[PDB]
Please model this.
Amino acid sequence: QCVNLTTRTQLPPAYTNSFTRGVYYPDKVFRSSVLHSTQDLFLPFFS
Amino acid sequence: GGFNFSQILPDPSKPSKRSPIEDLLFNKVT
Amino acid sequence: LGKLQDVVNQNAQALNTLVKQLSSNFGAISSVLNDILSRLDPPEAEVQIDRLITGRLQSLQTYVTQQLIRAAEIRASANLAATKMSECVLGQSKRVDFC
Amino acid sequence: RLITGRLQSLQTYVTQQLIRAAEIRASANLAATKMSECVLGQSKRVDFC
Amino acid sequence: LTESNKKFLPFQQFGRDIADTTDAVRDPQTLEILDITPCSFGGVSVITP
Amino acid sequence: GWTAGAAAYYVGYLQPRTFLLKYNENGTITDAVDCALDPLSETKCTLKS
Ligand SMILES: *[C@@H]1O[C@H](CO)[C@@H](O[C@@H]2O[C@H](CO)[C@@H](O)[C@H](O)[C@H]2NC(C)=O)[C@H](O)[C@H]1NC(C)=O
Ligand SMILES: *[C@@H]1O[C@H](CO)[C@@H](O)[C@H](O)[C@H]1NC(C)=O
Model:
């Protein structure tokens, strides 16, 4: 079950800037001392 | 007669028969 | 050194490109020939194999032509170096702005 | 089929242009040597300049 | 399958190289890293007097 | 009347984009380079260096 809330004074959402964030391993293989480029969903830098 | 040729002549101090300049030359390029 | 580095870097990238050629489908539905043979029977998979063969042949003939051009250029440079060895080193050359 | 035809045309054009590049490089080396010998001095080589 | 000296991160199975060839695989038995190297190299040649 | 402590979370949306990933001798990612953000980044990722 759930209950409802009561209206009140809130804060508007703010907008910030990312700094080299949102990077993960795109696959489950091992790479050493290489520079490999992939096409995958990532987060943009300085977005 | 005054010409120093040790830079281009091979040196027996190292096991390789290389001159120091060609030692640097081989180490320069991959 | 650029003259001693380009002749190695171009060869390395040509070999790497030759390796990269086998990762392409050439319009087929798979890159490796074993997957098509395992998933499709050979009588119907003959056109896929044949297009893979002709794509790999085109890539290899392009690599061979590039290697022949590079061989011709290196042979010209080697002939120039041999003439320089014979004249500039093995004697004194009267040709100004050559040694 | 149009793709493979266009690639064949571009490959034969690239081969032809690279051969012309080799010929132009040979002519350029000959012209540079001719300048450096016949122009920037006097060349002893008979029937060269 | 040689005994390699490089350890894999604990979420990977395969391993590639600079030339992008699967030359390193992880055995699922007891988590050891084994290299992959082809056994057939080059061809034959005959010396005749 | 309630309290929630102090917290802050960021929500970002991913887009289909090519990334150049750097790998070390250990096997982890150290830096990433874009191709559709900066001309310098595009130059870095097209040269694969
Ligand atoms: C020829 O040149 C070499 C330079 O490589 C001289 O060798 C140096 O000599 C000085 C003086 O004793 C030393 O401090 C350096 O360590 C030496 N360097 C090397 C690389 O050996 C050599 O003495 C010169 N010989 C003559 C006859 O002039
Ligand atoms: C990472 O590589 C360095 C360089 O050889 C090595 O000293 C270090 O032990 C490695 N770390 C791990 C966790 O393998």
About this structure: The radius of gyration of chain B is 11 Å. The pocket of ligand 1 is lined by residues B 4, 6-7 (CB under 6 Å). Chains B and D do not touch (no CB pair under 8 Å). The CA atoms of residues 1 and 20 of chain B lie 22 Å apart.
